[PDB]
Design an enzyme around this catalytic site. Structure first.
Site, PDB file in Angstrom:
ATOM      1  N   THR A 194      42.430  26.971  41.465  1.00 17.18           N
ATOM      2  CA  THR A 194      43.661  26.761  42.228  1.00 17.18           C
ATOM      3  C   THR A 194      43.610  27.380  43.619  1.00 17.18           C
ATOM      4  O   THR A 194      44.608  27.330  44.345  1.00 17.18           O
ATOM      5  CB  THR A 194      44.877  27.297  41.469  1.00 17.18           C
ATOM      6  OG1 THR A 194      44.776  28.722  41.315  1.00 17.18           O
ATOM      7  CG2 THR A 194      44.960  26.635  40.100  1.00 17.18           C
TER       8      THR A 194
ATOM      9  N   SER B 116      38.671  32.794  47.105  1.00 10.03           N
ATOM     10  CA  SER B 116      39.604  32.588  48.206  1.00 10.03           C
ATOM     11  C   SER B 116      40.882  31.953  47.667  1.00 10.03           C
ATOM     12  O   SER B 116      41.011  30.725  47.648  1.00 10.03           O
ATOM     13  CB  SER B 116      38.987  31.716  49.304  1.00 10.03           C
ATOM     14  OG  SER B 116      39.037  30.344  48.954  1.00 10.03           O
TER      15      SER B 116
ATOM     16  N   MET C 161      29.683  34.262  53.828  1.00  9.38           N
ATOM     17  CA  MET C 161      29.283  35.470  54.550  1.00  9.38           C
ATOM     18  C   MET C 161      28.160  36.152  53.778  1.00  9.38           C
ATOM     19  O   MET C 161      28.374  36.612  52.653  1.00  9.38           O
ATOM     20  CB  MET C 161      30.467  36.420  54.708  1.00  9.38           C
ATOM     21  CG  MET C 161      31.713  35.795  55.317  1.00  9.38           C
ATOM     22  SD  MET C 161      31.609  35.595  57.102  1.00  9.38           S
ATOM     23  CE  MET C 161      33.274  36.085  57.561  1.00  9.38           C
TER      24      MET C 161
ATOM     25  N   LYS D 138      28.521  46.221  49.973  1.00 10.82           N
ATOM     26  CA  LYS D 138      28.662  44.773  50.059  1.00 10.82           C
ATOM     27  C   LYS D 138      27.793  44.041  49.042  1.00 10.82           C
ATOM     28  O   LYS D 138      28.070  42.877  48.728  1.00 10.82           O
ATOM     29  CB  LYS D 138      28.309  44.308  51.470  1.00 10.82           C
ATOM     30  CG  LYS D 138      28.902  45.178  52.569  1.00 10.82           C
ATOM     31  CD  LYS D 138      28.914  44.446  53.896  1.00 10.82           C
ATOM     32  CE  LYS D 138      27.506  44.203  54.411  1.00 10.82           C
ATOM     33  NZ  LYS D 138      27.533  43.456  55.703  1.00 10.82           N
TER      34      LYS D 138
ATOM     35  N   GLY E 132      44.938  37.604  63.047  1.00 13.36           N
ATOM     36  CA  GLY E 132      46.325  37.809  62.698  1.00 13.36           C
ATOM     37  C   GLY E 132      47.144  36.548  62.568  1.00 13.36           C
ATOM     38  O   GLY E 132      48.364  36.639  62.385  1.00 13.36           O
TER      39      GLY E 132
END
Lengths: 282, 286
Positions: free
Chosen positions: A10, A82, A111, A117, A151
């Site tokens: 979703t 995401s 990325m 990481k 932003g």
């Protein structure tokens, strides 16, 4: 038919991956998590998957054994968050326990974290799970349609910040195209246990080249405030990754072979160019 | 063209109202709140409205004068809070009163008439009346996504697999309406002279169904009988320790226990809306 479980279906990228897996002909399973069962839009999205032939499989990240039972039913697991580190690691533990998974494709949001990481990749390695990593490009929804303004995800009004001189090459890709590449590569013998770089040549653009595309479509020049590198860093982790992309040019400072680049591996994908992408918002 | 501001346009009902307002040809304004800017789904939805001719108006519930400036641009304010994130609606009323230009306010009540604690449920209607704000209320029906598709069970919008709770005997008439249809009725009524300062009842005759009749539709669509647990009114109330509205609808029959006239019923006022019946609604789950 390859059997594929999509986790995060979703999400913005995840729902495009479900659609691309169905279009490619995979037998497509979609993890149905309890928390989204009360969200009317997410329920109708899952039902649009079903009508196209997808199987909904119930499970949740807080229920280890439900994750094991979901992945025990497929050959390939695709994850797209995401829409996060602990969650991927819970998937890795369930995959390791299940033992049957032929390939795991965790989303890394395009990325490459090997340039901690590395916690998910290190757990994949330590578990002996086969995999494919797709990296190397900024998603157009998050860096393109906003002219890379931070932003905000909305298109620009009359003014924009230009990062440095805006002459550093960035790589942009439509999430629809990332989803097609994921669905093409997930049973490709050429990409088993490989990193695949997504670098569509026509979408290799400096920030000023992206701005000029917008200015040409709107027939008007944007007001510009130039932000130097240290003025950027003095205003401070994505902020750090953004700096690596737009000031150090990390997406374009190394060559990639044709045998490991998505547009060369999958030339049947007619990837959306950034002028076609931006046209929708003018 | 009537100028309409939709508040809550990234919500469930609210995004359908925006769509129906554009379909009707209203000059459609949508409040664009700072708090949805992190959500790419919400941002692209709003950009889809702008692409279809809507105007995006920046404003925030925590910024009183941003709300005044927003409502000062339109003739009608429609608000719908289902899927967004009593104070919010009361903030809108305050801004409408101060603005002074609004010809009609349509606060969604999720189909639930609050005028049937009583004073807390009536707080928005009382503030509307005290401010002299003209209005239309739409009431009388359960949204099918929340009461129909799940066979009126709790905690999920999916229908059950092989077990249902039947409330009482499942022989109390309930009224169901597709959220899409509620949105069209909203867009049609908001500048209808006939409904100024009226309550409009949404009672599609083919969708007046007892819970057993609704379950039977699903059993026929799937060709399987569901295992049934009957829940008495006493046991329902004991387990309450929203459910109150549920009890009044399914045990007391509060949606079907009074008559409505043609001049105040949505399908009579707007017979061009071909409302979706529940057999068609449920088929998408099969």
């Amino acid at each position: 038919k390859t059997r594929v479980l999509v986790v995060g279906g979703t999400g913005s990228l995840g729902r495009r991956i479900v659609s691309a897996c169905l279009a490619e002909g995979h037998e497509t399973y979609v993890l149905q998590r309890p928390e989204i069962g009360v969200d009317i839009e997410k329920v109708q999205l899952l039902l649009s998957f079903k009508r196209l032939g997808a199987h909904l499989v119930e499970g949740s990240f807080s229920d280890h054994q439900s994750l094991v039972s979901a992945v025990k039913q497929v050959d390939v697991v695709v994850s797209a968050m995401s829409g996060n580190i602990p969650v991927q690691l819970k998937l890795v533990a369930a995959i390791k326990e299940a033992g049957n998974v032929k390939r795991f494709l965790p989303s890394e949001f395009g990325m490459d974290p090997s340039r901690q990481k590395m916690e998910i990749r290190n757990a994949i390695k330590a578990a002996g799970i086969s995999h494919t990593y797709l990296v190397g490009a900024c998603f157009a929804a998050y860096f393109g349609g906003n002219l890379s303004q931070m932003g905000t995800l909305f298109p620009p009004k009359n003014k924009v910040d230009i990062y440095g001189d805006g002459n550093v090459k960035v790589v942009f890709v439509d999430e629809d195209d990332m989803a097609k590449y994921t669905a093409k590569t997930l049973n490709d013998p050429r990409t088993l246990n490989k990193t695949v770089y997504v670098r569509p040549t026509d979408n290799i653009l400096t920030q000023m080249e992206l701005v000029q595309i917008w200015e040409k479509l709107t027939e008007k020049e944007l007001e510009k405030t130039y932000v130097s590198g240290n003025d950027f860093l003095a205003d401070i982790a994505g902020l750090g990754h953004f700096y690596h992309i737009y000031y150090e040019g990390c997406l374009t400072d190394h060559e990639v072979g044709d045998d490991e680049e998505a547009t060369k591996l999958y030339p049947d994908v007619k990837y959306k160019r950034m002028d076609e992408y931006l046209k929708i918002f003018v």
